[PDB]
Amino acid sequence: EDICFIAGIGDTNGYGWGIAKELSKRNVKIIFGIWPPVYNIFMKNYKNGKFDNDMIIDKDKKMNILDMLPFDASFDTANDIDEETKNNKRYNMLQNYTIEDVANLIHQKYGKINMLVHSLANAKEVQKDLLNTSRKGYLDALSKSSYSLISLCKYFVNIMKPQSSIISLTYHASQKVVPGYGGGMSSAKAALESDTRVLAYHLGRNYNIRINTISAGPLKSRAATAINK
Template sequence: RDKKAFIAGVADDQGFGWAIAKALAEAGCEISLGVWVPALNIFKTSFEKGKFDSSRKLSDGSLMQFAHIYPMDAVFDTMADVPEEVATNKRYAGNKAWTVSEVAESVKKDWGNVDILVHSLANGPEVVKPLLETSRKGYLAALSASSYSLISMVQRFGPLMNPGGSVISLTYNASNRIIPGYGGGMSSAKAALESDTRVLAYEAGRKYKVRVNTISAGPLGSRAAKAIGFIDDMIRYSYENAPVQKELAASEVGNVACFLLSPLASAVTGHVMFVDNGLNVMGLAT
């Protein structure tokens, strides 16, 4: 039986979510996506127009397929949480059932149980502000979108995961080390995500017999990273200082995700795995 993977946080072919989808597709998984509601239209249009065809190509020449593409907003758990201005926003009003609980229900109804759950999303409205200047609202928004969203997904998808299943998210070493410029509470959100990975590994491990890990990735020029503003400097810094001097490819993260999500990693859970050309082990920039 092909394994089924639900991936939240794909809205183009540039980020880690897409690369993970591709690695899983190469390994024979069926894939469904949860796409952020405001990004769904453009994603679907680009997809239908063939804009992603070259990056959809698998090694056997076929194109990666998605079983289902759902609108999703990981900041809301049920419709009761959605404020009026979001519910009536024209980008949301045309879509249905995009809260985390509703997406999980749709997946169960349309597709049945899943084996793999991928959380590849983050958002911090005040990311460009230093922590010292971050508002309470901005900080909580960063934690809501980037950390609680994982808890919510494991809560709602856990019951429809097959025993032996596996969950993965993406984190960043700003949780442990000071990365000036990674602000707005995003460093805090990643620290929470890593701690929650351990606690969820225990709780969901016992309850659903699934594993929960996170990948601490090096810098990649994705859409989200470009919004932070200094990604080119980070890529250059990593290139100059990491033990392995090359630019990180999204596919390298996709491959490690595929390993962690597979039975090859059946004894690995609660782990933060660095996929960063080794930058995190350096103590002194050279």
């Protein structure tokens, strides 16, 4: 029984969906981690059948989603939630969306998993070039897009079976310069790739868990459309 948690799904036009689509081909149970801000709109679209066609697997089957949970990669534990968001319009009617909370939530409902997918990224100032990115914007990119992978591993390794596997997505902008990919995203991806190596060592030696990162090519996804350059 394979269960995979995919953190970073907001629709069917991103890589998260492509990964979920291929995993279910192999009958693995899928759990989605949806960023609170778009969680309701996502459930609405799902409920009204907007994704029915996108859920049909080649072999003439229905993609099987075990569960869909609100999840924000910028909060590690319950006490990390600031009062501003704590009372935000989109968060109020939601709960248990921190990294540790969904880890406990998933474990409480489905037991241990053996597949983890980090498929998210964010950066307040992605529209500015590296030189004009502020300290706050830079740290925001690394927090959401890089550290989020480390925190995920730290809390989820507890609910994972030995020999389980973890992947994340990165982009070549970390190694070669592509103008337009600003706001510290290139910095975050460069850290993601390096951390993947270091984490491979700690997770490999201590838990026999593997971790790798996929450097993908261009895909016209929602986030991709947001890079005005």
